[PDB]
């Protein structure tokens, strides 16, 4: 038996659902250790502990733009830090050693028993996700880091395409009326640098810049698809692997693919 599963077995419903089964409490971080700011997100009744996500905001913008992700994943069985970056105009290297940092923070509470996550984290399981610049530095953490054992950002922004290094399993989602970083000449060539690993591409149908970002209107498919994800691929968890990898089929997509899943 995996000893890493948690949660009743997923159903669509249960995924697509606005909360997962756990009960979610939150707090801030007191003392940012390299980064700007972060809120915790984290369990309170899971059943043992539970891989940890580091998510980063893009360009001028702040943990509003992706705090939807925190409690959603949480509620199924994560402790997720959504960060400020030290400056609202860092770029995506920046941004992923901040991303870094937070995780690194992450530890360092799992191991303070004044925390509210002491020892309820396995530091060993852990995955990155962020928005355009933010999506850029979750990219560069994988490729630095392949002990993460999942990626998946969003909108990705970033000077280079070639992520050929990347051996982590990531899911790209991508807007496709995107102007700030075109899925042509970023998402979609990003995604084919990456040849080692397991990997997916979903792109929201008539998506701005903004599509997967706290108040998208597709949070019941873009929520199962992140936290089906992180499922199978930061809990080992097969009950994910059909949810984790198949298409959806759905008319809200005008673009799937994956490999290797």
Same mark, same amino acid.
Request: aromatic content about 8%; hydrophobic content about 35%.
């Given at each position: 038996?995996?000893?890493?599963?948690?949660?009743?077995?997923? %159903?669509?419903? @249960?995924? #697509?659902?606005?909360?997962?089964?756990?009960?979610?409490?939150?707090?801030?971080?007191?003392?940012?250790?390299?980064? $700007?700011?972060?809120?915790?997100?984290?369990? %309170?009744?899971?059943?043992?502990?539970?891989?940890?996500?580091?998510?980063?905001?893009?360009?001028?913008?702040?943990?509003?733009?992706?705090?939807? /992700?925190?409690?959603?994943?949480?509620?199924?069985?994560? *402790?997720?830090?959504?960060?400020?970056?030290?400056? %609202?105009?860092?770029?995506? #290297?920046?941004? =992923?050693?901040?991303? !870094?940092?937070?995780?690194?923070? *992450?530890? &360092?509470?799992? $191991?303070?028993?004044? @925390?509210?996550?002491?020892?309820?984290?396995?530091?060993?399981?852990?995955?990155?996700?962020? /928005? @355009? !610049?933010?999506?850029?530095?979750?990219?560069?953490?994988?490729?630095?880091?392949?002990?993460?054992?999942?990626?998946?950002?969003?909108?990705? /922004?970033?000077?280079?395409?070639?992520?050929?290094? *990347?051996?982590?399993?990531?899911?790209?989602?991508?807007?496709?009326?995107?102007?700030?970083?075109?899925?042509? =000449?970023?998402?979609?060539?990003?995604?084919?640098?990456?040849?080692?690993?397991?990997?997916?591409?979903?792109?929201?149908?008539? $998506?701005?810049? @903004?599509?997967?970002? =706290?108040?998208?209107?597709?949070?019941?498919?873009?929520?199962?698809?992140?936290?089906? /994800?992180?499922?199978?691929? !930061?809990?080992?968890?097969?009950?994910?692997?059909?949810?984790?990898?198949?298409?959806?089929? &759905?008319?809200?997509?005008?673009?799937?693919?994956?490999?290797?899943?």
């Amino acid at each position: 038996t995996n000893p890493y599963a948690r949660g009743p077995n997923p %159903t669509a419903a @249960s995924l #697509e659902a606005s909360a997962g089964p756990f009960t979610v409490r939150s707090f801030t971080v007191s003392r940012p250790s390299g980064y $700007g700011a972060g809120t915790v997100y984290y369990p %309170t009744n899971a059943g043992g502990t539970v891989g940890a996500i580091a998510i980063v905001p893009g360009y001028t913008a702040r943990q509003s733009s992706i705090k939807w /992700w925190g409690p959603r994943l949480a509620s199924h069985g994560f *402790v997720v830090i959504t960060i400020d970056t030290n400056s %609202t105009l860092d770029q995506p #290297e920046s941004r =992923s050693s901040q991303q !870094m940092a937070a995780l690194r923070q *992450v530890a &360092s509470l799992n $191991g303070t028993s004044s @925390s509210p996550i002491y020892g309820k984290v396995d530091t060993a399981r852990m995955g990155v996700m962020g /928005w @355009s !610049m933010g999506g850029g530095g979750s990219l560069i953490s994988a490729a630095n880091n392949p002990s993460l054992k999942a990626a998946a950002p969003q909108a990705p /922004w970033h000077s280079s395409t070639n992520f050929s290094s *990347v051996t982590v399993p990531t899911l790209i989602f991508a807007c496709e009326n995107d102007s700030i970083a075109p899925v042509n =000449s970023s998402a979609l060539p990003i995604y084919d640098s990456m040849s080692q690993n397991a990997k997916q591409f979903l792109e929201i149908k008539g $998506g701005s810049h @903004s599509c997967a970002n =706290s108040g998208n209107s597709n949070q019941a498919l873009i929520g199962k698809k992140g936290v089906a /994800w992180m499922k199978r691929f !930061m809990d080992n968890d097969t009950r994910y692997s059909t949810f984790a990898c198949e298409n959806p089929n &759905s008319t809200a997509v005008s673009d799937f693919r994956t490999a290797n899943c």
